Amino acid sequence: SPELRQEHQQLAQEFQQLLQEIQQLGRELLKGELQGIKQLREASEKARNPEKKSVLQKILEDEEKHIELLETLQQTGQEAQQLLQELQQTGQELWQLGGSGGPELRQKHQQLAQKIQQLLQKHQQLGAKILEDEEKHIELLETILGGSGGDELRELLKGELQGIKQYRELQQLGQKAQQLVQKLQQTGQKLWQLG
Numbered sequence: 417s418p419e420l421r422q423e424h425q426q427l428a429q430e431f432q433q434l435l436q437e438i439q440q441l442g443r444e445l446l447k448g449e450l451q452g453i454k455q456l457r458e459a460s461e462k463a464r465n466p467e468k469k470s471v472l473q474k475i476l477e478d479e480e481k482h483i484e485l486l487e488t489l490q491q492t493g494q495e496a497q498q499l500l501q502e503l504q505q506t507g508q509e510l511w512q513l514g515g516s517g518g519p520e521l522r523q524k525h526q527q528l529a530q531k532i533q534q535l536l537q538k539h540q541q542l543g544a545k546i547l548e549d550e551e552k553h554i555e556l557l558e559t560i561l562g563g564s565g566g567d568e569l570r571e572l573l574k575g576e577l578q579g580i581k582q583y584r585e586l587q588q589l590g591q592k593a594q595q596l597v598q599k600l601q602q603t604g605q606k607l608w609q610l611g
C-alpha cells in the first residue's frame with residue numbers, strides 16, 4: 417500500500433530524530449554526574465555526624481558506579497545508532513529491489529531490527545537502575561534532614577531532584593523509542609507480505 421511505505425519511512429525518520437535526542441540527553445547526564453560528584457565527594461569527606469556520613473558515602477558509592485553505567489549507556493546508544501545506519505542502507509535497497517532478489521537482505525533488515533530492540537532494552541534497564549538508585553537517594557537525604565535544617569544537604573537534595581527530572585525524561589524517550597521500533601516491525605512485516 418502507498419501510505420504503508422510512507423508510514424514506515426515516517427516512523428524511521430522519527431526514530432532517527434529520537435535516538436539523536438536520547439544520545440544528547442545521555443551526554444548531558446554524564447556531564448551532569450561528573451560536575452556534581454565533586455560537590456558530593458567534598459560533602460562526604462567533610463561530614464562529622466556518623467548518620468550523615470554513612471548516607472553520603474552510600475550515595476557517593478552509587479554515583480561512582482553510575483559513571484560506569486552512564487558510559488555503558490552511551491556506548492549502547494552509539495551501537496544502536498550504527499545499527500540504524502545499517503537499517504537505513506538495507507531499507508533503501510529493499511525499496512530499490514521491490515521484493516526481488518531473494519530473502520537474505522530482508523532477513524538482515526529483520527535481524528538488525530530485532531538487535532536494535534535488544535539494545536534499546538539494555539539501554540532502558542541501565543537508565544532504570546540509575547533512576548531507581550537516584551530516587552532511593554532522595555529518601556536517604558530526607559531522612560537525615562529532619563529538624564536540623566542542613567543547608568548543604570538541601571543543596572544536594574535539590575541537585576539530585578534536577579537529575580531525576582532528566583533521568584525520567586531519558587526513560588520516557590526510551591519507552592517512545594521501543595514503541596516506534598514495534599511500529600516499524602508492524603508496518604515492515606505488512607510491506608514484506610504484500611508487495
Ligand code: HEM
Binds near residue numbers: 525
Ligand atoms: C520486522 C521488522 C522490519 C521489516 C519486516 C521491515 C521491512 C522493510 C521493507 C519491506 C522495506 C522496503 C519497503 C519500501 O520502502 O518499499 C523497508 C524499508 C525501510 N525500513 Fe524497514 N523493516 C523492519 C524494521 C525496520 C526498523 C526497525 C527500521 C528503523 C529503525 C527500519 C527502517 C527502514 C527504512 C529507513 C527503510 C527505507 C525507507 C525508504 O526510504 O524507502 N525498518 N523495511
Ligand SMILES: [Cl-]
Binds near residue numbers: 464465468
Ligand atoms: Cl556534620
Ligand SMILES: [Mn+2]
Binds near residue numbers: 449478479482483
Ligand atoms: Mn548517578
Ligand SMILES: [Mn+2]
Binds near residue numbers: 549576
Ligand atoms: Mn543520587
